[PDB]
Design a protein around this ligand. Structure first.
Ligand SMILES: COc1ccc(S(=O)(=O)N(CC(N)=O)c2ccc(N(CC(N)=O)S(=O)(=O)c3ccc(N)cc3)c3ccccc23)cc1
Length: 286
């Protein structure tokens, strides 16, 4: 009877179709309607209390194909419903919500490394392209803060990135903001109390466990306590003023651990474990 952390899809051995939700007050997991097609490297977001699944890579009998798909899940009806697909496929995608619109940002088609972002209008059920990013980004993290969209880290097709750019919908243009002190692709990026948090990811050498935040007051990146477990391609969300990071890859095993970050005490604790270790999930809280 509360807001829940949903995790859709993921990977373990092959692409996953699970939808599950976690209740933080009683620490319990719920099993909900599976995705109609299994996907990993998708992103999740919530608009108008609906759960949208964006992008990822399909796994199917035809083959493993990068997805263009947008699908919408209603917690009241426990039902998945297809919507209009994006202009292009996008694996390793990031998404953010501004003014009840979904921004699909970056991602990979084959090895087209996208730098185009498109915006979906739920009422109209339409996707319309907007200004493309300055940089090509896949495995990119996205965050919205004061109606400004941030794309953080990723891989441009040749380099792993520590830059981050910020989108002013007002002007429909992108500007580069201060780079992170760490190169992160596949990171977890969320907003919490006027900070963007980039957590884990891959710097090109090893999977990361460090966490840094961009304080927009200072437009500079600080380090904070690190996670207990290295993890790349994690899912991240914020719930009741704490950060949650779910699963991911450590270079060795597919994590099932869920860690919770208290900004007040600047510490991480492991609050639970998922039912199955996985990575590349989409996460949203409604
Ligand atoms: C073989 O073992 C597996 C390890 C992970 C998975 S996955 O389910 O999580 N998955 C599914 C997909 N490709 O769609 C993904 C894989 C790699 C990514 N990165 C590349 C990027 N950002 O471009 S990475 O930086 O995080 C990274 C780099 C190197 C290593 N060794 C590990 C991770 C992803 C980034 C965002 C979302 C998903 C990603 C499946 C098998």
């Amino acid at each position: 009877v509360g807001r829940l952390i949903y995790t859709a899809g993921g990977y373990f051995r092959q692409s996953l179709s699970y939808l599950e939700a976690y209740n933080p007050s009683d620490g319990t997991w719920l099993r909900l309607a599976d995705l109609q097609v299994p996907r990993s490297g998708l992103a999740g977001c919530v608009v108008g209390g609906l759960l949208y699944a964006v992008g990822g890579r399909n796994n199917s009998p035809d083959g493993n194909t990068d997805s263009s798909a947008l699908d919408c899940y209603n917690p009241m009806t426990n039902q998945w419903s297809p919507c209009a697909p994006m202009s292009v496929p996008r694996n390793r995608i990031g998404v953010g919500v501004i003014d009840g619109h979904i921004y699909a940002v970056g991602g990979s088609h084959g090895c087209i490394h996208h730098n185009s972002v498109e915006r979906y209008e739920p009422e109209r059920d339409e996707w319309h392209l907007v200004a493309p990013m300055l940089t090509r980004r896949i495995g990119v993290g996205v965050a919205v803060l004061n109606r400004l969209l941030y794309a953080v880290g990723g891989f441009d097709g040749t380099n792993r990135l520590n830059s981050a750019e910020c989108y002013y919908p007002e002007r429909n243009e992108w500007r580069m903001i201060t780079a992170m002190n760490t190169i992160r692709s596949g990171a977890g990026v969320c907003v919490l109390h006027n900070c963007i948090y980039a957590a884990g990811g891959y710097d090109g050498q090893d999977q990361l466990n460090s966490v840094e935040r961009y304080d927009v007051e200072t437009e500079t990146w600080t380090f904070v306590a690190p996670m207990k477990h290295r993890r790349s391609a994690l899912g991240i969300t914020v719930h009741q003023g704490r950060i949650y990071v779910l699963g991911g890859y450590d270079g060795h095993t597919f994590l099932d651990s869920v860690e919770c970050y208290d900004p007040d005490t600047d510490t991480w604790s492991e609050v639970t474990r998922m039912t199955s270790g996985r990575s590349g999930v989409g996460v949203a809280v409604t």
